[PDB]
Ligand binder design. Structure first.
Ligand SMILES: *C(=O)[C@@H](NC(=O)c1c(-c2ccccc2)noc1C)[C@@H]1N[C@@H](C(=O)O)C(C)(C)S1
Length: 250
């Protein structure tokens, strides 16, 4: 299951990793760089997957929800508009995530984190800033490893979390991206950020694959590296995942 021959060149210049597991059997299908796989880091926008489960479970959104933009610039042009739960997921609209956390509230988020067994469960935010409610998952206190993300994703698709079944399937639906070359279906989510107080970038791309073979899988592509001042780490993590998945017979 060592796929280093293919994955190494794709992750050159970074500390990267890749994991692919069969969702039903938990069999490891492919791995690159287990040491990086075990290292906890900020989930960044991949935390939206957890927030989506919470929001649907708590019945504060549905698929017809329109998140209303406040007309002020949010940093990225794609963020400067109304959104749906689908486009929230697709474009990692951070202000929607923050609207959602403020609505659920800290203690209830902590309770969900405990139910999800999610990473270090540290939602305290930045030292001395009391900003955890709206920043904890963004290069801050909350950390989770690629291996932990695999098992979280596995729980989701197997309905082994104490949330509404619809909350799970609406969130999965809203992750759908495309089909791959052999028609396998890709459901995924990016996240990226700079490491606090450093120049390093971290990136993720993770999710589900549903094969016409019948098999379902969960995967995680993640990296950390000095890639300059343009945040491209999730672009790279995504690219790499798709390249690697298309080489496989799933
Ligand atoms: C989630 O990971 C979100 N990332 C950020 O908010 C982010 C940025 C940023 C860079 C460029 C433009 C806007 C924001 N800088 O630091 C952080 C923590 C969103 N998701 C990312 C993704 O890969 O999904 C981005 C870069 C698209 S923004």
């Amino acid at each position: 299951t060592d796929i280093s021959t293919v994955a190494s060149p794709l992750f050159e210049g970074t500390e990267g990793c890749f994991l692919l597991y069969d969702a039903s059997t938990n069999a490891e299908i492919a791995q690159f760089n287990k040491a990086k796989c075990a290292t906890q880091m900020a989930p960044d926008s991949t935390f939206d997957i957890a927030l989506s489960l919470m929001a649907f479970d708590a019945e504060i959104i549905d698929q017809k929800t329109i998140f209303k933009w406040d007309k002020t610039p949010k940093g990225m042009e794609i963020w400067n508009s109304n959104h749906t739960p689908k486009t929230w997921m697709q474009f990692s609209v951070v202000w929607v995530s923050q609207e959602i956390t403020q609505k659920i509230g800290l203690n209830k988020i902590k309770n969900y984190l405990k139910d999800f067994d999610y990473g270090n469960q540290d939602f305290s935010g930045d030292k001395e800033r009391n900003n955890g409610l709206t920043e904890a998952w963004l290069e801050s206190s909350l950390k989770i490893s690629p291996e932990e993300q695999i098992q979280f994703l596995r729980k989701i698709i197997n309905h082994n979390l104490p949330v509404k079944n619809s909350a799970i399937e609406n969130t999965i639906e809203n992750m759908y991206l495309q089909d791959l070359d052999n028609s396998t279906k890709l459901y995924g989510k990016t996240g990226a950020g700079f490491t606090a107080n450093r120049t390093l970038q971290n990136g993720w791309f993770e999710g589900f694959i549903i094969s016409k073979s019948g098999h379902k899988y969960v995967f995680v592509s993640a990296l950390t590296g000095n890639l300059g001042s343009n945040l491209t780490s999730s672009i790279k993590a995504k690219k790499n995942a798709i390249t690697i998945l298309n080489t496989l017979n799933l």
